[PDB]
Each structure stands twice: as structure tokens, then as C-alpha cells.
Symmetry: D2
Subunit: 415 residues, 4 copies
């Protein structure tokens, strides 16, 4: 039984693909594989106050189909919270509510997702040229292999730690903050260091300050202070569907300009409200004569070691150009993520995937990896296209349009 398309990973990207497949008139067969037990959308960072960084109109389908049964508005309506939400006049739902949206959409979905199923490899199907791929799926019980004419790889970002620092029972990446935090005695985290100047670092510091009144926090970051995230309307147009074409069709020189001028829309920046909330907290503590938030600016974390009952963090100060040690209970590294890379999974298919001058995968406008003739099945990327398609590639900004374009591409090449 050969599938038209197999989806690796079931995050918002492949979920929107599933929605696009269902809404398409095209009769396409599909299977989706998620390693986790259920949809799990950055749950390590599902902090109490956390807000979406994208408007509710940017959901699973709305920009492609303005009357989708899978829209956020449909969700609110079924949950009897549309009127309430509307009264709030805020475009940004909580991360918690959006997670419920994802689960709700997955349930409404006709197709049944295969959970606890880790794709361990993708191998060429029989033939030359290769017209199908073999997908190795490892469940808790057995292992199996499915065959598909197309694959869509959407396995998400991979946590990035600072150069000389390894995850530990006392050094956590921000992606696994709540995982470790919940398991911990309250009075076993009175001193916490958080490295980074982005949204994650800011949200964790805010949470720590608000969670206990005694916790002392050291926010270590290279900038002189948090930099604001730009989502003013003109700059925000880089997230437009049409901006994908501008980026894709533009010269390397234009592509560079996107990053040079608009990196501050997405990376190493913090939402206005979070910055201001942190600043008020610091101010009020000063008034009260009880400072707890220590902003260690113009600085990098360069090492961490466990010494008795302390986590010894080595901090490099750019101002003085020297290192020193900071003793805390826990070091949280909110130091970001590296992009999705299909290379690992593609194993030997990769040989046939054409690279560019930089060493990156060549991808067509329709998100399909460029291959030699020796390979003829479709390999589509949702994620890992920051160099070809631009800043929206790993975001929720353009799920609706990308998923639709991929389905169309698949229908057209089967067509």
C-alpha cells in the first residue's frame, strides 16, 4: 500500500498539511508519524503568562481558506469563547489556548495520526530511478516500514547550547525548563542564572520573579538590555505570503538585506509588554529595598561546572574583557535553537540532494528539495528553509499558505 505522501513529525506545520489535505478536493492518501504520545508544542515553555507571538488570524488555514472549519475562530466558536475573546480585543491568544486549538483541530481531523512512532530513517524504494521512499517507523512494540511517493519532513528546531556547556541535572536548555522545574523542590532553586536576551530568557526570568518572592535571578546577556521585537506593520510584511516570493526570487544580496534589517523581528528580541513588565518589577523591588533581578549585561556564559551544592557558572564580561565565576543553584540556557535539518533522516537519499555554494540544501519554490534525476520522489521541507524561503519558514506565520502549496505541488506531479 503506497501512500501519496507521508508526514514526518506532527507539529503545527504537518497538522496544517493534514488540514490542507482534507480540505483539498484531490484524493491523496497520507500517513503522519509523531514520536511523542500526542501533540506537544513546546510544552517545556508553556509558562503561565506566555502569549502567542502571532495574530490569531495566522492559524492553520485562514489565509488560504477564509471559511475553514479548522480556523481559530471556528475553534473559539465551538468552545463557546468567541464572544468572550472578542470582548478582550487582543489579537494574541495565550500559548496555552493555542495548544488547545492544536489538539482540537487534530481531533476534528478525519485522518488518524500515528503517535509514539519515531521515524528512524528514510531509504530509497526499489528501482532506478527511485519513484518511492521507504520510511522506517519505530513504535514501542515493533518496527515497520511504509512506502510513499512523497515525504514531508517537519521535525522542528533543535536546541542550541552555548559553546562550552552541556545539558545537565543543573544546566537546562530553556526548551526543557518546565520539565525540570516542576520536578524540583521550591527551596532548591533560590538562585537561578538565565543566559540569553531573547523571548525565552525574558519569559523565564519573568516567571521566576513572579513564582516566588525570594528567588534571586541573574539574567546574563550580551546586549546592554533587552532589545524590542519589531512587529510594526511595514516590517511585519516580511512574514507575508507574498514576501516569500520576494525573498525566494531575490538575489543573495536582497536575501542578506532581509536579515540585516529585519533580524530583530524574530531573533534575540523580546515582546514590548514582557520588557515593560520586567522593568516595572525591577523598579518596584528597588523602591521596596529588596532587589532580586540582577541584569548582567554585555556578558556571555562560557562554562558551567558542579561544585558541591553549587552550579558554578563562568561569565565572560565584554566590558572588562575577563571571566569570573557566579554560584547559583541552576543555570538555564535560553540560548535559542538551530534550524531543522533533513540531512540526518535522509541518510543515503541525501547523496542525491543537490547543495548550493554554501553547503545548504537547494529547495524549489514549492518547498521540494532539488534532486538529481536519479531520484524522482518528492521530498518537501516544512522548516529548514530559512536560506531559500526566509524568516517565516520555521514560524506559524505562513502555515496555511505553505501547506496548501505543498498539497497542490503533490497533486500536480501526480496529476
Amino acid at each position: 500500500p503506497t501512500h501519496d505522501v507521508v508526514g514526518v513529525g506532527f507539529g503545527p506545520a504537518n497538522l496544517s498539511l493534514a488540514v490542507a489535505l482534507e480540505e483539498s478536493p484531490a484524493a491523496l492518501t497520507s500517513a503522519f508519524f509523531e514520536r511523542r504520545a500526542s501533540i506537544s508544542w513546546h510544552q517545556g515553555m508553556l509558562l503561565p503568562a506566555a502569549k502567542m507571538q502571532v495574530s490569531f488570524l495566522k492559524d492553520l488555514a485562514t489565509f488560504r481558506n477564509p471559511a475553514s472549519r479548522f480556523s481559530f475562530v471556528s475553534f473559539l466558536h465551538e468552545r463557546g469563547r468567541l464572544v468572550r475573546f472578542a470582548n478582550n480585543h487582543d489579537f494574541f491568544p495565550t500559548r496555552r489556548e493555542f495548544h488547545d486549538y492544536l489538539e482540537w483541530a487534530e481531533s476534528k481531523l478525519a485522518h488518524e495520526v500515528s503517535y509514539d512512532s519515531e521515524v528512524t530513517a528514510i531509504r530509497p524504494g526499489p528501482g532506478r530511478p527511485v519513484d518511492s521512499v521507504l520510511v522506517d517507523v519505530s513504535t514501542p512494540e515493533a518496527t515497520r516500514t511504509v512506502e510513499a511517493r512523497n515525504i514531508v519532513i517537519s521535525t522542528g528546531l533543535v536546541p542550541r547550547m552555548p559553546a562550552g556547556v552541556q545539558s545537565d541535572e543543573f544546566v537546562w536548555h530553556s526548551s526543557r525548563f518546565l520539565d525540570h522545574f516542576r520536578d524540583r523542590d521550591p527551596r532548591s532553586l533560590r538562585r537561578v542564572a538565565v543566559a540569553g536576551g531573547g523571548q525565552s530568557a525574558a519569559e523565564i526570568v519573568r516567571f521566576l520573579h513572579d513564582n516566588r518572592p525570594d528567588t534571586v535571578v541573574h539574567a546574563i546577556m550580551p546586549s546592554y538590555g533587552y532589545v524590542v521585537a519589531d512587529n510594526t506593520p511595514f516590517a511585519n510584511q516580511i512574514f507575508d505570503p507574498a514576501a516569500v516570493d520576494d525573498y525566494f526570487d531575490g538575489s543573495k544580496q536582497a536575501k542578506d538585506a532581509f536579515w540585516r534589517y529585519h533580524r530583530n523581528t524574530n531573533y534575540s528580541v523580546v515582546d514590548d509588554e514582557v520588557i515593560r513588565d520586567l522593568y516595572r518589577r525591577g523598579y518596584d523591588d528597588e523602591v521596596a529595598g529588596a532587589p532580586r533581578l540582577n541584569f548582567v549585561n554585555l556578558a556571555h556564559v562560557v562554562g558551567a561546572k558542579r561544585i558541591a551544592d553549587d552550579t558554578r557558572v563562568t561569565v565572560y564580561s565584554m566590558a572588562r574583557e575577563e571571566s569570573y565565576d557566579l554560584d547559583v543553584d541552576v543555570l538555564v540556557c535560553a540560548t535559542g535553537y538551530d534550524p531543522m535539518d533533513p540531512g540526518d533522516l535522509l541518510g543515503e537519499l541525501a547523496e542525491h540532494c543537490v547543495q548550493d555554494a554554501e553547503g545548504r540544501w537547494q529547495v524549489d519554490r514549492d518547498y521540494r528539495m532539488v534532486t538529481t534525476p536519479d531520484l524522482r520522489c518528492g521530498i518537501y521541507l516544512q522548516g529548514g528553509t530559512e536560506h531559500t524561503h526566509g524568516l517565516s519558514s520555521s514560524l506559524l506565520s505562513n502555515l496555511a499558505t505553505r501547506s496548501g502549496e505543498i498539497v497542490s505541488s503533490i497533486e500536480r506531479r501526480k496529476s
Copy 2:
């Protein structure tokens, strides 16, 4: 040919009724009659800057049907402005754009509206009890009569002038501001008085200030300054669909409380941004040494007379408790509207319509006038239900839910 339902008037209310009819599985026959040549939604007040006072989610259908082809989101999508609109992150469209939305929806509607068709009267059909009404329609060419089992009256508000003051060549109600203003030669309106402290008055004064740099404006209002319109989320719940039930089922005492505490959500109040903009304008003029906006507070316009080349406005000052004269070119009365009243159109049928203690029409929860057993046909009101259904009755707030309720009521009764 007897219609299930005839609609009198084609504003947003009956338009949403038409949409509800089309979306309903029920096979109901209908006809709609609008006097004007086309949809005309307060065009006299379609000022350059004017913004909706209602969220875009409160459109023709969305609260009833979250995936309607007639939703504002569908409209934006079709116009290729959805992405642009989203980037703006504002829930409130311009009045200009909403007008286009109405026209767009009317065009998409399968049914064909009858324009240039004034309903002059509604008369009882043959038989006793009366099972149908006869609707007299006057076109430019002929006159005709149509028969219906139900009618829905949605003829809108009626302009209310100050007591001693009549519309004239130099005394305009705000509802006809642009009608008169465009027909004037600029420079013949160097001195304008605007009476009122509500959104209309504020918008007109702002427009006048911005339109020409030399115009002198007298803003005459009873309050000490503009009062802000409350749309904070808890108070804004009075506009909820469910609030209709709370108001309807509540005692007169409760009904009174709605008005006592929340009149400032809708009447005699001004949007925050408009107030702030007016204040900045006045402040900068002061800095420049060229004041043009004169706020005449704690005051009422009590008369107007034409004397040579001057419109003489008589102003009563509450502070000094005395009247005085103000000479201007034009007096604009932004003094509000009276509610829709179905009594004139009803004529003979009114005898079978039951009134309450206060002499107002009794209306059922489903917007159907209460009648004696002599009348079996349905008379539904969209508008004129402020005393039975509450503050949303004449607003865009609840079009989707009311229209659906009426269609359901008609379907239910159809035997």
C-alpha cells in the same frame, strides 16, 4: 404569490436577515424593499477618518456561523486585503471599508433586493383571523402590493433635532452633514457651530479642524467636556448575545440598572482616540497662538434664526443660567436619533398589537411583536426593541444572532 417573509428596509439588519435566510436549510421565500437606490449606510457621516465602533468579528454572520461566506474575513480575503489588515492589528475597520463590505455581501447574496421601493403601508390581508399582510410598495414608475405571512421591519433610526430648532439651509442634522457640506463652496463655511457631545459631534469637529486651517468651530455641549465611551471588556458584555437574555428576562429594575450604569457604552460618549486627537489639536493651536476650536461647555443650543448673512444660534449657559447669541455660517446639530418605531407603517394592524404599561410595543424574545388572536401573521422588529431587548437592539453588535433567531422563529411557525 405569498411570501414567507417580506423585509422592510435594506440596511445591515435586513442584510444579515437575507444572509441568515440563504444560509438556513429552510426553504423560505422572501422579498426585500429599500427606498434608496442602493445600500446607503449613514453616508452623510462617512467622514475621511471615521472608524467602526464595533469589532470586525461582529459582522453579518460570524457569531452565528464561524465559517460564513459572508464574514468580514471572507470579504477581506476576496479583496486581497486580509494579510494587510492583519498586519495592522486593529479590530476596528474604517466606516468606509465596512460600507464596501455591506455592498460586497449584498452582491454575493443570491436574492435580488428591490431598490427605489418605498414601503408606504402595511395592511391586513383577507380573512379573520388575519393570516397575511399586504405590503404597499411605491416605486418611481408604479405602485404595487405584495403579500406575506411575516414581515420584518428594519427601517432604522430617525434624526432628532433640538427642541426649538428646525433643519434648514443653514441648520443641518449631523446625519446629513456631508450631503450639505460638499454642496458648499469652501470659504463660505469659515464659522461653524456644532451642537452635541457624542461621537457624531466629535467626529464632525475633528473633520472641520482638519479640512481647512482657518475654519473656526464652536463645540456646544451640556457636559464639561467629552465623556469617554466605555468598551472595556466587562462593561462590553452588555452587547453579548447572552446579555439579550439577561436584559429580556430581567425585571424592570434590572433593565433600569443596565441603562443607569452602562449608558456610557453607547450614548453621549466619544471614542478615546477621537477625544485624544481633538485635545492634541487644541493644544498645538494654543502653542501656535492660533486657537480655532472653542469648547462651549455646560451649554445647550435652544434656537437658530437666519439674519442676513449670519446663522444666529441661541445658546443657553447652565453656569450663568442665561441665553446669548452666537453668529456663525452654519449650525450642525449632532443631537442624536430617536429609535425605530413600527407604528406608522403598521396603521390598521396596530390595533391588534399589544402595548405595555408605559405605552410601548410588547415584543417576544424572538423579536416578534405581541398581538391579539385577531392577528396570526408575524411582525418582527430589527430596531425599536431597546425597551425589551436592550442596548444592542439598534447596533451592529448582534446582527448575526438576531437574524438567525428570526429566521428560526419563522421556520418554526411555518405550518
Copy 3:
């Protein structure tokens, strides 16, 4: 030793009087008497998040003297927080910081305030006509009497409870919220009812929600939802120094208009941010499936009784027009305050004080009570002048100007 002026009470009002006295070139002798041990500015309501409802520019002196050593800006500067405060770009300090400002100003003040000194009575001095008053002061040790030519009464508002409800171990007025709350055991206040729809009620509910995750709160209020406080710039002009003259010189008709149109600036209304924060809290709880905030609208608390371990609150529902019982641990009445009334402390002198038609004290523009020729000494009111001077009379809005006018009046009479 006869003083030019004695001040009864040492809150912000008399504090600004002290400042005006020190800054005045006039050589006036004074004494101030405060019952409490130190300045105590609504400490029972000094909640963690609480923010001033007045701009920092409205401090002890700034509107009168733009370069006062007692300005809030001077305070910030001495506390090394001016730059930090400026970076925040918020006109509204915390109540906590403002309290600190008051104490700071009191210290910087040359004059020494007499604390733990309750003024028990004011009696006429010797002679006829009366040229001085005798002020009876009760300290913890002894009692004494001082003599003064003028007296300024600024004893503050008096807590108002609902009719038929008395303060008790389990029924608290909002003014004494923190007093009682700090003194209970956190696990003993799992169910709290808060009566009222104003700033106090809102702030207490917010605090309760944020303080513990399990507390269940019933917010009982007559309106359908919190009403927003108006401080938009035109309406806000009722707090202007000049507005005092408009109100004072205006007819009763005009005075009524101030209250009719602008009560929503000050009474029974809540700050925008607090309303929105409460609404987000309620929304997120619903998403989480753990509702804790119960808004009991269109309702009054009419009785409270202790029954075993429950405080049984009798609630009247306007909608149903019937009472019912609500069992909680504690009832907090955030039901407001009655104005300052000099009558009680005046005793014998009150006969020579002239009343108006409505039975309230007549007061001159300079805040001096109108007396018969029998009294020649000056009795000045800071507070209790809402009927003569308007809504700013009991607020921080106009401390600088009023205090200056009183000092001037005293200097002028002496002369």
C-alpha cells in the same frame, strides 16, 4: 503662645499645607496634629500592584511652584530613581512609591509634626467676638490645649458600610483589608466575597486572585460589569485648578451637570488596566477549566451573619428581585467612603457656622467656612467641600493650589 494656624490631621492635604507655609515668604506660626504614629496614607489598601490614580505632576506643590524642593521630581532625584522612572514612561507611580514620597517630604519639612496626638475638640477662645479657637489635643501620656487664630481641618474620609451590615471579625471594610488579611492564616480564606464595583473592589479581587491559586472569589456589584474610569483629557479638566472656579461660581444647575456627566471620573469606576487584567485572569481560568472568579452582577449585599464557621452573606438580585444566601469565610465591603465633615470636631463653634438650603456648610472660595459675626477666627476645610468646590476636593488633584490659596488667605486676613 497663639499660633496663626493649627492643622488637624496630617495626610497629604495638610502636608501640602505645611509645604505651602514653608515656601511662603509670610512668617506664619503653625502646629500640626496627627493621631497616628506617623503618616499613614490608606495603608490598609497598599496592595502590591496598586497604582496612583493621579499623574506624578500632581504632587505636593508643582502646579503652584514648578521648581519646588518638595516636588515628586525632586524626590526621585534624591532617591537616585529619576532616570529609571523616566525610562519607564509612565505618569502614574505606585501607591507604595507615593507613600514613600509623602514620608520623604515630611522629613525634609523644617516644621516638626506632632504625632500620636488626637484632636478631640475645638472650642471658642476667650472674648466676643471670638478671635481664636482652643484646640484640645489628647496624647498617650497627657492632654493639652493650644490656641490658634485659624484652623485647617483635613481629617479625611470616613468608611461607608452597606446599610444593615457592620464591621466585624469576618466583615471588613476595604479600608482595613490588609490590616485583617495579614493577620489570618492563608488556608483560612479560601472563600471570599467582595462587595462593590469600584477601584477598591477591583483591586482587592485582583490581589486575591493573584495571591493564592485556590482562593474562590465572589465579586458582588450592582452594575452588569465594572465601569471604566474616565480620565481622557477633556473630561479630566474637571480636576483642573481653574475648574474649581467654574464649579464654585456656577449655578446649582451647572454643579449638578458636573456630577451628572462626570461622576464616572472618580466614583464607582475602575482603571482600564485593572479591568483588563481581571478579564484576562477570568478568561485564562476558563481555558484551564478552573474558574475561581464569580462575578455576581446586578446585585447588592444586604446582610451578613456568622453561622458556625461560615460568614453568611445575604445577596439581593435585582434581576430576579429576590434575596439568597452566600456562604464564604470573609466578606470584604469595598463600598466606599463618606466625605469629611467638620461638624463633629466643631461642637460649640458650629452654631456660628452658616448652612445652606440643603443643610450643608457654606464655604468661601478660599476654603474658609462662612460664619456669623460671632466668629472672627478662620476655619478652613481641606476635604468636605464636594458641594462647594467640586470633585477634586478630596483628591490629590489640587493639593498644590488649594494649600497655597489657604496660606494666602490666612496671610491676607492677618493683614
Copy 4:
């Protein structure tokens, strides 16, 4: 008659110096020379809507002296606009009001400034080592020379045009926008090109759009859209007085970090409100079917030439990577400014001034140029210190503190 200090230029910087001199107890003699007829603070850009980019608390003196007679608050008070301003609740005055503030402060100043006086050169005084400088001043009538022990150079920024584009009758730098614009027949500027993505470009485009309804505007800028200016509170701390020490004492590596992370606080960025206003304007025009604003993004102006009645602008597109011609009536270059450089004026004295590795002037913490022992007189820079003192050097952010430090330095060295 040898002066303690001579000030070259009379902008806000030297004005704050004059204020610091007057407020200082030190008896220092001074003279100030301004080439313009009066204070002239970027008048070519005094557009109708233009707002200050700095809080009113950052004025001539307030951060140094919180009760200065020259504070903005003192100014508002004198102008009888303090209460009005406070009601507005906006920290940012208009540029127009701030200009009045500067004139007001100059008038209040005891010292009298010499206008129409261009400093053409600074020469060494007699003796070795040099203990004084000779300042050559050229008035309209005569020329003269004054002698001083110290000199403060504050001659402001110098306009920077795009490479290969010269100012002309139809090519204007933004700094001279209103100069040219007022001298032009309104019907002669139908087509305008504005080059740049910063505050100036944005302000000019908004002005053009608002000034005439038919003007077509081409906004040519290298970014994909306007980038927002960061003034959120943590990043804004780079403008703090204390931040000057952090920057000054910090290593080159730290200095670089300031620019790398926080250049978006000051250069090539636009105020939030201006961006959103522009976006609304563009949106409404699209709704109306009359687009007038053309955003030419990812592009540079590389040439301009007059050809008949067309100003021919050559535009380089980074995307397509090709230059094309754009025909307009006028080209406005809002392409920024180069820093103040004392080199030109110093002439012979530069021989005793020390340069750093990069060839820039070495400056001490107290704004005094580093010299050899051959020169003993003080040369102070207000401006041109972006490399030693940081981003605030050419801004209004730190006038009060810098001016005070310079006066102190001078007093200390005369001692």
C-alpha cells in the same frame, strides 16, 4: 579681557552649558557665538506633526538640578500650559513647543548671546605652552577676536547626501526640506521621491501625504520596510547618564556591542506611531482605489539629474540587481548626518591634540580633548564624541549632566 570659556555655536548643547554656568556658584566668565540670527533648531524639519523623540524630563537641566528655573516644567508653568500638558498624559512634547522652550530659556538667561557671529577659526594664544586660544568671530559688519582659557565646540551635525548626489534646486537634503518647500508653488510638487528609511524620511512622507491629496510619493529605502525605533526601558538605559561611564570605561569590544545591539535606538529607525500612521494612510488609499504612496524597498538612490521638467532619479534595486530611472519633480534625501568634527575649526591647534589608533580625536571623560603639554587650554566637545562617550553624544538625552560636568571640569582646572 580673557574669558574663562567661549562657546562656539548656540544650539541646545551650548544653551544647557549657559544654564549650567548661571546655576553654578563658580564665577566664570563666558561668551557664546551663534552664526544664525537666533536659536534655530532644525527648522527645516519643523513639520506640523513632528514630536520630540525624548521625554520632557530630559530638558536643559532637570537630571542635574531637579528644581531648575530652566526646566521644561518651569516653562510650561510660565506659559500657563502645565495643567493642560499634564492632562494630555504624553511625555513627548511637539518639536514646535520644544523650540519655544529653547527660545524661552535663552531669554530667561542672564548672559547675552552674540548672534550673527560666525566663528571662522580658533588660533593659539601667545606664549609656550599655550594657555589661551584666540577665537576669530566674523559678524556682518566687522571681524574680531576674543581670548579664552577654554573653548566648548558645539556646532552640530553636518548633512550627509548619498554618494554621487549633490544638493540642487530639485535635490534637497531633509535638513532643508521646509526651506525649499515653502518657496514652491503647491501645484509644482505633484511627484516627490524621498530617499531614506529613518525618522526624517518617514516624517516627510507623512507630511507630503497629509499636505495635499493628489501628491504622489515614492519612498526609496534599503530595508524591506520601516524598522521601529527601540525606546523600551532596558534598551533605553544606553541613554542614561551612568551609561556614559559604562561606554567610556568599557573596552572597544564592549563599545562595539553597544552599536551592534542598540543602533536601532537612534539610527535608521522610525517612531512606532509614525509607522502606524503611514500604514493606515496606505491602507485607506487602497480601499479608496487611489494609491499615492509607493514604497520602493530594498533599494538605494544612486543618482539624480535634471532633464527638462523632470528630476531623473536613478534607483538601484538590490532584488533585481539593476538600476532604473524614476521621474519626479523633486528628490528629497533624508539620508542622515555626519557627526560634529572639531578638526576644521581647530586648524593649527590640532597639532597639540592627540588621535587614537583609528585616527579619531582622543577625549577625556569630562569631554575635554586630549592634548600635549604644549597646550594647556581646555578644548571641550559637545558633539563628535560618539566614539568615546556613546550614542547620547549628539542627542538631547544627556544635556543636563554633560553641561554640568564641563562647567565643573573648567572650575576645577582654574583652581
